Design a protein around this ligand. Structure first.
Ligand SMILES: N[C@@H](Cc1ccccc1)C(=O)O
Ligand SMILES: N[C@@H](Cc1ccccc1)C(=O)O
Ligand SMILES: N[C@@H](Cc1ccccc1)C(=O)O
Ligand SMILES: N[C@@H](Cc1ccccc1)C(=O)O
Ligand SMILES: N[C@@H](Cc1ccccc1)C(=O)O
Ligand SMILES: [K+]
Ligand SMILES: [K+]
Ligand SMILES: [K+]
Ligand SMILES: [K+]
Ligand SMILES: [K+]
Lengths: 194, 84, 194, 84, 84, 194, 194, 84, 84, 194, 194, 194, 194
């Protein structure tokens, strides 16, 4: 069952209470002029970061898939994405690069962008998020192939770990011809390279 | 009210010339034909005149004021006058 | 009273429980293979981000302040810093630039770095963090002047707000000659500029 | 104590106006309604007043001071007054 | 017309020296051998002379003016003269 | 046997003494106001640079290895590293680039970062360091393949040699599919390239 | 007394023994095929870094000072400099920028560079190095003014401190007109700025 | 020696205050409690005092000096005094 | 020739001090021991002296000149003197 | 007397003879298939580098100076220049920046470029070359002011000195308003700055 | 026979004379206060640029070749080099890129750097310099392959030719697998590419 | 009288004829397959480059000037411009930067762009072009001030002169407050600077 | 027959007349103080842009071709080149990249540069210029292959066309192994790429 506006309102207080607890558990006075409304804002923020749960690929699907008799690689690169690390509940920021070999059917930008948001705005693991976006595109188009690449900075190595904001994690999922034909894979990596 | 402060900017041979603040003598301001205003963002009113500072200095002498000191500051030329 | 290693261990469970609550309150099953240890990791992380509370300028102070008979501006720039937004409990990352006019007494790097760590690893507001570091340096050196500038990206405007990771917030605190003498201030901004 | 120094910044038609230092006559400061403070980072105390320098010049004449010189420096306008 | 303002720039030992504005006494301007002009872009006329300010000050004394104040502003040196 | 906190304390003095000796052997007065605490700080530093000896891949191992049913290339790049030249006892600084084809098992960031720290903080030879990190990742994951690339600047050619800080040394180790399949090797170098 | 070729050879063995000691004091076997000649190489290195002690501004002085009837600012910027931190015996690397207002007498480039080497190649403190180069130039030219600015990365904050190779320390010494005239100081900072 | 020059920087309500050069009257300098020094790099000695310029102005009046002119230059406030 | 202008730069406690322009009284210049020159690029001659302005002021008083005004402009300190 | 095509031809052989001598004095066989024509090529080169001696500002002068009733700053920047160090006979390469406040008369690009070439193509000292170009422009225009700035790399510090091609020398000459009006000088440096 | 310190001193006078001659042959007065010591400095310089003649790969050889059981590509790139054109006696500056597939034996940086210096500090032809450095490495290591790439700027086209400092000459020598295997060659060019 | 569509057609042949003559005077055969239509194309081009004569500020003027009660500096920067050198008939390409302090009246972008085109598309001298645009803006707005800066590359120095496409010419015209107030002038140069 | 110095002087007047014509044909008064000497300068310029006709590959040929027993790719890149569009008589500016596999014989830089100058300074079409340079090198060397790539900006699309100075035209000619072996071609494009 997909999360809903009702669920949020019925849970917001819980979240607000959990955060108010944490504030104390850390040493803060949840009553300070600048900490009063925090529990709620923090909660509101944590719901926005996980708002992906209240959606499904279906909501997007057919609404915007056009026939353009096109059968050559299509790429949409440098798509900003923000997500949450299911391990430390700290976000990891980055960029998403998508490419696919249409089988007549093409996907609209807005729709594609929505698919990325749906799976990214929820507790994730880069590997899984990459894969989920690739399969979603595969199902919504029955393409000859599809490739997805994500490069991201994980804040749990920037602040934590020591001081490694420099570090970047790259993951990828190659289905169809993007998996079997090295040439298609190379050209995709070239066209997003720069 | 023995002291008065007037000023002009960038160039001296042309106005506007600042002739007063919010607590200036209303009559004197009127005699000089000074307009009043509060520039957006400023928390104070100012009295100005479109004449060159030299002209304002002559009028001011007629009312009994004399120039005690003149100084530059930033791009502002300032005259300090004293009456009697 | 500065927080302590005991305080943490006695509170860890409480934090863990609050996060375990949040997990559910969001729609997740705190039981998943990958979500089991989360509440603890999440709690440990949030403690590391606020480990500054268990410290005081005193611990640093005299331990490393040398006499080098120097009286000309000294600058340390591009010091990486990570902190937590007291308003949304989301972090804001950036750089700190510091300058001061010594009165014979100089401050060692590590000590300086420690001062920055102490006030940044806790719930903060950029304006405050800037001022505290400036004052901490003024007390640990009685210098003729000191200046501090921080530029940071606030994650609550990158993901939230809409999508503004571009935005940067700059704050400064100028004490002593750094406040009164425009020439000193300019030289300071020039020398960190590039 | 024959000499006195006052000053204002950025604009002359509005205060604050600095009227004294740490070794200023406490009575005179009180007569002007001047507050005292030490800005963070500074190694000295200063006496200020919320009035425009022109107003402070009039009050100062009543106590027997006269303007000897006025000058700009940086963004600060300074008046040097002498008593008798 | 008791007050007069003259000025020079960058260096004092050489001119030009600005001696008047649009409403200046035509006779006095002529006595100083001052030319008139309106620099492109400016909304005002100015009277200038090729002599160093020091020379212009001597001539001005002969006509009864005395220097009351001298100040710098920007890269401009300005003299404020008063007649009688 | 792994070095331990005890070993350090029992050796600190010995180091301090060796350095205090060197100070003299060079011409300095180990008594100067600023050279007094040097023999100790020098020894402390020299131990921090080699603190890798007091650890083993085991300490890290199982602690963080998750099953994510992933079987496509995973890359972590631009990992800052600092190491010591066993030849001149001067440090060489740089970056490490890692990649591996998982066989279901994935390695967590922190664990990966710890593996790099363990072998780099000790007297090394870039060639060896590269290989040790590679084998350590192979042992902790039984992957289909792994590739490690290190690019560093050796200070013994910046100051010494003449003045060659410009110089960069590049080493690599490719195991499994990374060694036998030119295509995997190329994709790896492309993905870390930029 | 300036150190000399003799002093070195008579001390080399002492240094080699001290390092061989340190090798042991850390956990290494000074007998390994690759650690055998290290005590010596380490020692030779440590002497090359401090070879500045075996020289004096005099050796440079008059040899290259030409009359060119020049009285306008002259600037030599982006001079590479390597030095040793007298606090941790770890090096700090960077750039030196020199400017001066001649009084008819100009300095040759080689001589200028020689002055930099002489004071940088020895145990130092950035603030002190800066000032020595400034005075050395002042004494060798009786100029109307002189300015020196050093920007360097301290390795005891890169590896140590945590991981701060980003940080940069900027010091300066302004004598004569460079101290008293804000305009000369600004021009000097502008011309080295880019 | 009829003329004297004193100055202060950045702020007027606090010293140091420069009271003399190398050819200054040793007695007067001593009366003010002025120290002497030559800042590294400078080719000249200077006499200074830790008092605010206002204090130095009062002391100077007692020795017969009067303020003729006060001016700003750079970040330096300067007083020109004349004796008799 | 009733007016005279002298000046110094950067610092007041040391020279050189500019004492005249091309049309200055040759005798007075000689009395001050002033040299004459035309800096490359400038279209004018200037008379200078290696003495600090304070010394030049004393000498000038002996010849009958008095300081009317002192002002800063740029990095130049300027004195306006008047004879009789 | 300006050098002439005759002087060259009547001297080439003396040059070729000196270079053939140097070849031997170094250890080479002037007879090698690739060194045979070298003495002449070297000689020809060395004359091209000093061909400025066979010219005078007069040859350029009036030929191209037009009246455009212009009295605002005119700047020509990033003019490439190549010159010979009169001290080591090694060249120094760089860029020239010129600006001047016309007094109705303007100078033609070509002519301005010729003035630079005339003084740069001869044995020089950066300080002197800067000054000659400045005065040359002042003479051919009677302008209200002129400024020249030269930035260059001296090959006698790139190869020689140690290895310092990084180093850059900056010289300047400011006549007229460029010298007396700080504002003009700043604007000039700002407009060439970028 | 390798040139020696004796040869130089016995030839220095001969060089000084040749340059003193050239000075005259160009139109200069070898007597000017600034040209007096030139014949000697120019000669000293010319010997420093060709000091590679007084050395052989043997001097370097065995002194620093270690066994590290490594058998994967090793690369040292961006090595600054300066040389002399045997055709015009004008220097060409640039960078060297070296790569080799060790057969157990590895070469130390210093030694590698020394090899480059030896052949570049002498009259050269880029194509020859490239090949000599490559063969030297092959002889000192019996590697499975080696590759050398030089990119330089030739001053005989910067100043001469017209004004072509933009132009860059690229030469390479590929031996062993670097010649026969396109994949090794590509990886080497990729790894030095950036 | 402004040039017109009739004048062109009545003159095009005259141009084509002239070019056909030039083609021969050079050595070409105005008959070759590819040279046949050249005289006309060259003519069409030369008219397009000078189409500015057939226009006047009037055509633009009142058509787009709006009242927005604005009295703060407005800046339009990086306006590409192409012009012809009246001296060699070769074009000079560059950018125009415009600023003005409005007196209630503002100028629309198109109109401004059209003013630049009008005077640039005609035989010009950079100094003149800068001034004409400056005055044109003054007349069309009675502004408190206006500033114009033009930076351009002159092809008569790129190809001709030798090879100097690097060179850039900077001209400016400052009227009103942009001329008298140094502060306004500085801000303008700052805002267009980057 | 190659054009000659005589031909020019006997035609200059004819050209001058044609241009003086164009001046009128456009709307100008060839009598203006600034337009007077234009017809001659314009004529002079137009002959310099086509001075390539008065030469032949022969003039260059043998004069500088050396035997260096080299059989690996040689590349000379980023050679600046200017030319004339035979279609609109507007110039096109760009860069030429050359590479060739020598058959023992190598080409000198100057000679190579002269070849480019010869064919570029004359009315041209990019495709043709590329081919003539390629063939010229093939005839002067009998190499195993040669490659030439030209990238240029066409001024008849910058100003004309609309405003397209952004656009670049790339042409290439591959002869010999450069044509037949895809591997050589790739290496050549990689080595000039950056
Ligand atoms: N704008 C003048 C200063 C000035 C301000 C006000 C009035 C007169 C002059 C300058 O910069 O030189
Ligand atoms: N701020 C004004 C000057 C000023 C300062 C203070 C008081 C009065 C005037 C300027 O920049 O022109
Ligand atoms: N140009 C002088 C100031 C000045 C302006 C006008 C007259 C005299 C002096 C300076 O910058 O120091
Ligand atoms: N520093 C003050 C001016 C000032 C300096 C020195 C003495 C008095 C006032 C300013 O910038 O406004
Ligand atoms: N150089 C001083 C001002 C000054 C100049 C000349 C004489 C005296 C004082 C400053 O910038 O603060
Ligand atoms: K005004
Ligand atoms: K105020
Ligand atoms: K002047
Ligand atoms: K003070
Ligand atoms: K002085």
């Amino acid at each position: 069952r997909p999360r809903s506006e009702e669920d949020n309102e019925l849970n917001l207080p819980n979240l607000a209470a959990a955060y108010s607890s944490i504030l104390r558990s850390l040493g803060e006075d949840p009553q300070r002029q600048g900490l009063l409304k925090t529990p709620w804002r923090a909660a509101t923020a944590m719901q926005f970061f996980t708002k992906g749960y209240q959606e499904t690929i279906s909501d997007v699907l057919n609404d915007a898939i056009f026939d353009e008799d096109h059968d050559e690689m299509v790429i949409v690169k440098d798509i900003d994405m923000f997500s949450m690390c299911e391990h430390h509940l700290v976000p990891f920021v980055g960029r998403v690069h998508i490419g696919y070999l249409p089988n007549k059917q093409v996907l609209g930008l807005s729709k594609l962008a929505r698919i990325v948001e749906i799976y990214s705005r929820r507790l994730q693991v880069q590997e899984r998020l990459t894969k989920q976006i690739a399969v979603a595109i595969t199902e919504a188009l029955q393409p000859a192939g599809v490739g997805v690449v994500i490069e991201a900075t994980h804040m749990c190595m920037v602040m934590r770990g020591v001081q490694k904001m420099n570090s970047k994690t790259v993951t990828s999922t190659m289905l169809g011809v993007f998996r079997e034909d090295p040439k298609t894979r190379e050209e995709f990596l070239t066209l997003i390279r720069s | 009210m023995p002291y008065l402060l007037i000023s002009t900017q960038i160039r001296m041979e042309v106005g506007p010339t600042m002739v007063g603040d919010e607590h200036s003598d209303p009559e004197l301001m009127q005699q000089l034909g000074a307009s009043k205003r509060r520039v957006l963002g400023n928390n104070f009113y100012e009295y100005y005149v479109n004449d060159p500072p030299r002209i304002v200095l002559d009028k001011l002498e007629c009312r009994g004021f004399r120039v005690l000191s003149m100084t530059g500051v930033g791009q502002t030329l300032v005259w300090c006058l004293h009456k009697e």
